[PDB]
């Protein structure tokens, strides 16, 4: 599978620029063009050889972890460190198939009886995403907490923190141009900080955005989604026109 | 202080300078504010593309553009109607791409009343 490499140690504006672009162009590989705006592929007939994304990140301890991306959805389907590699629950047995061939060489696999959705990474972490920290600072510790969990040396409630640092720093990003934007500046300006409803409010509606977008008559919307400004003004979106700075990617819909 | 008539069908072209930023190597936005509303995205172009951005109710009248030579970026604005009264305002970025979630920019310009008859 395509590897993407990206280290935390000296991590500057636009060397996690180059990074989110490539994995955006590995992502992309087999997209189409909705409205300007590029669709990930669905499963139906997506090659296995294809189907994943391997993002290897480093920090400045030198401990290294592998996450596998699905293409299909940007999201994170697991992990490897060392000699063992951990999946989040399948949801379905064609995943479960697919998730085989990620990692063959480990001699330690576990998949845990979880998904790898919000609502229950936040339930095991013991905070919401809104008080959880992002940044160069928040990703490096997330790498060391991911290395040392077969070790034993890592909890699940720091487990699962931990993964919502990477999917919000990677996934997200690699979705949402605007997300990708706000990482830059915590990078630019050497700050952590949580993300604020209105990146919270985007990510929750991914699916929605998409589904509203492919199923438009030429852009216009058969009926208005509500977005959060950053201010926390709330206003709805008729059109994908607005959207189009917004949104890198999209779920497939057809 | 907010700057400061036309016709309707008529044309006005908005500037975006400032003497410290090397607008090339910055995202440029364009908003607008009516008196009891909030700042409406207008249009935006790249940093690192040429590439433009427009809400779907100026497509084919407003065209943003920078020139390089001047270290400027326009927006010309033909096919002027009543209802594109408003304050004009341009942001930048380096990091950012100007959108309608959020107004949170390393530079805005300037406004401009814009009034269309």
């Known amino acids: 599978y395509p590897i993407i490499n990206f280290t935390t140690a000296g991590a500057t504006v636009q060397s996690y620029t180059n990074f989110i672009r490539a994995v955006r162009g590995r992502l992309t590989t087999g997209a189409d063009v909705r409205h300007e705006i590029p669709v990930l592929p669905n499963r139906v007939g997506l090659p296995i050889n294809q189907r994943f994304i391997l993002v290897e990140l480093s920090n400045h301890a030198e401990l290294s972890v592998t996450l596998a991306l699905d293409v299909t959805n940007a999201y994170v389907v697991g992990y490897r460190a060392g000699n063992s590699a951990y999946f989040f629950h399948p949801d379905n047995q064609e995943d479960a198939e697919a998730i085989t061939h990620l990692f063959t060489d480990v001699q330690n696999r576990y998949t845990f009886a979880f998904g790898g959705n919000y609502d229950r990474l936040e339930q095991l972490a013991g905070n919401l995403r809104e008080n959880i920290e992002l940044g160069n600072g928040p990703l490096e510790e997330a790498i060391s907490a991911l290395y040392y969990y077969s070790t034993g040396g890592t909890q699940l409630p720091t487990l699962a923190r931990s993964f919502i640092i990477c999917i919000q720093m990677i996934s997200e990003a690699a979705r949402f141009q605007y997300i990708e934007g706000e990482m830059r500046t915590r990078i630019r300006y050497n700050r952590r900080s949580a993300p604020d409803p209105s990146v919270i409010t985007l990510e929750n509606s991914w699916g929605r955005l998409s589904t509203a977008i492919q199923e438009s008559n030429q852009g216009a919307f058969a009926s208005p989604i509500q977005l959060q400004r950053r201010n926390g003004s709330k206003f709805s979106v008729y059109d994908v026109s607005i959207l189009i700075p917004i949104i890198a990617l999209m779920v497939y819909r057809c | 202080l907010v700057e400061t008539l036309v016709q309707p069908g008529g044309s006005l072209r908005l500037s975006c300078a400032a003497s410290?930023?090397?607008?090339?190597?910055?995202?440029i936005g364009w908003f607008r504010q009516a008196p009891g509303k909030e700042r409406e995205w207008v249009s935006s172009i790249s940093s690192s593309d040429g590439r433009k951005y427009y809400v779907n109710s100026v497509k084919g009248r407003f065209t943003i553009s920078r020139d390089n030579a001047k270290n400027t970026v326009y927006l010309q604005m033909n096919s002027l109607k009543p209802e594109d009264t408003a304050v004009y305002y341009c942001?930048?970025?380096?990091?950012?791409?100007?959108?309608?979630?959020?107004?949170?920019?390393?530079?805005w310009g300037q406004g401009t009343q814009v009034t269309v008859s």
């Open positions: 410290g930023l090397t607008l090339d190597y910055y995202n």
């Open positions: 942001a930048a970025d380096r990091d950012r791409l100007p959108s309608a979630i959020t107004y949170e920019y390393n530079y």
